[PDB]
Write a protein that binds this ligand. Structure first.
Ligand SMILES: O=C(CSC(=O)[C@H](Cc1ccccc1)CC(F)(F)F)c1ccccc1
Ligand code: NI
Ligand code: NI
Ligand code: NI
Length: 160
């Protein structure tokens, strides 16, 4: 079941989400399946539960190949201070994109929907997706991270 994605301006994207506590359950499995379908229909590479107005620490991502992943109760830590600039957009901000700095190298930990633990090092684009989705879980959107406002604009127009 494809879910409506809420758009920037909705207060529900500004919340700090609570932890998932129904790992291995049918209800979580149905939510995650809905999230992959929703992401798929929207042509995304990530989707966070607050974007479909579900207040939980849950994201799905994947597609430089990023493994298809469902991640609950995510924790992230940089593995160096090295930042890298790259293009981001957001399903809740359709048509736009900007250049955003992120950590080039991270580790992320949490749980798969069946309750097994996940722990991975990631770099580049893989790492960026995860940081971007993690931001949704703490009520943060990418415009609050732009440094160079010349890069912010509509996808079909931008020539940076
Ligand atoms: O459609 C997008 C941009 S929209 C998107 O998928 C967001 C994830 C994202 C894309 C690119 C960089 C960082 C995060 C998801 C959000 F909005 F749910 F939180 C795309 C970008 C690069 C390659 C292929 C497709
Ligand atoms: Ni399509
Ligand atoms: Ni987003
Ligand atoms: Ni490497």
């Amino acid at each position: 079941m494809i879910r409506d994605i809420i758009r920037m301006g909705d207060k529900r994207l500004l919340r700090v989400a609570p932890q998932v506590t129904n790992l291995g359950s049918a209800e979580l499995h149905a939510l995650v399946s809905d999230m992959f379908e929703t992401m798929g229909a929207a042509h995304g590479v990530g989707l966070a539960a607050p974007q479909i107005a579900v207040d939980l620490q849950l994201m799905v991502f994947g597609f430089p190949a990023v493994p298809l992943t469902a991640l609950a109760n995510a924790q992230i830590e940089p593995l160096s201070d090295e930042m890298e600039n790259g293009w981001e957009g957001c399903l809740s901000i359709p048509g736009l994109r900007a250049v955003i700095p992120r950590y080039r190298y991270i580790r992320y930990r949490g749980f798969a929907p069946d309750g097994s633990p996940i722990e991975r090092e990631a770099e580049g684009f893989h790492a960026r997706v995860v940081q971007h989705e993690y931001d949704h879980l703490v009520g943060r959107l990418y415009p609050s991270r732009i440094e160079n406002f010349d890069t912010f604009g509509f996808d079909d127009v931008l020539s940076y």
